[model samples]
Target chain A: SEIDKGLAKFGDSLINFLYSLALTEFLGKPTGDRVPNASLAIALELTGLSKNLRRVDKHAKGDYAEALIAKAWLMGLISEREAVEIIKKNLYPEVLDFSKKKEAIGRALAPLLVIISERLYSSQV
Target chain B: SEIDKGLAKFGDSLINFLYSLALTEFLGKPTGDRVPNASLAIALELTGLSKNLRRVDKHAKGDYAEALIAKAWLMGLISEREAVEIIKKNLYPEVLDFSKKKEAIGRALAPLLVIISERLYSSQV
Candidate 1:
């Protein structure tokens, strides 16, 4: 029950990652860029992201901060270049400052996801 | 149910994250160095971790590599600095060269995860 509560909060935070990933992946494709064969692949990929988002959101609520940072990193709000730097700086390494919400994590993680998704679907990256 | 199939497979890859975090966390905590309040926090954190991993793994198998890298990066085998390097490196970017599964992804992501996990656990940095 308590864990569920935690999961609820974490899931709330993680929605940003899921939405951004979905939007970018959807928007990035043009008529030619679309890979039908990759539908199975993309569906499969969504399965993984969805599963993990649920896990990080539910069971690992305290660890949500880490996931939050991760979501940010994946979303491109935070540059790939900068995420690496922040990783060393201990942004979400542990004991997050709940006093402050990290507004930047989603920004960083999405672009990377788009890049990875495109490569997986088309082998063009 | 079909999604469940996806979840199962995707969750399996994500198991890497659950295990790595479990082992590292189990091993990393010291008697006093551990935080009591963070217990609910950590447990709560686990809720989130469990939920998301399940989602990504179940819904997004084609995208497993991205989560795998994210997991590895969270684990500590990969350095924070290098994960950033590879993000730009496009190793896991779009259109993955699956013909040659990149073994390097695991190697690069783990160390960075370790760094982030450590920071979240203690804030010593």
Candidate 2:
């Protein structure tokens, strides 16, 4: 039960972080099917990040969508400036690339994901 | 600590080798559940490379099952000889088109996703 409890607590933190990321990403682009609660939306967005589903798959055209944002954030190439432009100004492809440099992808994105996940955990207790 | 450690180790090897490819081409098109593990599954089968899943998505189709065989064998198209001689040999298309050249529908089936996955970065040491 300890592991379960830990997982439960960790999972909550993880989901919270994911959703937070999601909501922030969603706020940049407004589509009607929002999450029921602001917190819930952020959690949903985080789950989307970990799980690998994206709006493009669902036929949503805007690449500033939550999953893409999360992935970009995960990959580390997006600047805060770029994020703002992506969210506010719709300068989409200007921010990201899929050219297949794994190290660059990991370097750019992994730190933010870890930082966000850690932030969620520390805020918990 | 045990389960978390287990997951950490599992995840590490899962990325490294025969643990789990989680290749991206596997999602949707057939079952619409999302998550791109389907193409990986196809690659696994193509190579004669894989065995099974510990946590299968509820919406998964047996298409991944065949994919494992294909990837284990390193192929995109299956010959009539590889399948059942009398029934499934010809019955292969009953649900899936099984043709690399076929258009529309299952034509959504991409290349062996995990083939490059297994080939590219995967290793034991």
lDDT on C-alpha atoms for all candidate structures: 0.32, 0.30
What tens-digit string does per-residue lDDT give for candidate 1 at B1-125?
22333222332333233332232223332110111222212322332432444543444432333333344433444554443443233223211234332333333333433444444456344
Question: Which window of 10 residues has the lowest lDDT sum in candidate 1 chain B?
Answer: B30-39
Task: Judge the docking of candidate 1 as incorrect, acceptable, medium or high.
Answer: incorrect
Where is the poorest 10-residue window by lDDT in model 1 chain A?
A29-38
Off by over 4 Å in 1: A1-125, B1-96
Model 2 interface CAPRI class:
incorrect
Expressed as tens digits, the lDDT of each residue in B14-58 for candidate 2 is: 221111111111221111111134443443444443444434432
lDDT score of residue A8 within candidate 1: 27
In candidate 1, what are the lDDT values of residues A61-117, reduced to their tens digit?
323333333334334445544433332232231212333223223332334344444
Native-to-model Cα distance after best TM-score fit, residue A50 in candidate 2, in Å: 23
Could you tell me the lDDT of residue B112 within candidate 2? 32
Instruction: Report how far off residue A61 is in candidate 1 (Å).
Output: 36
Clashes of each: 112, 34
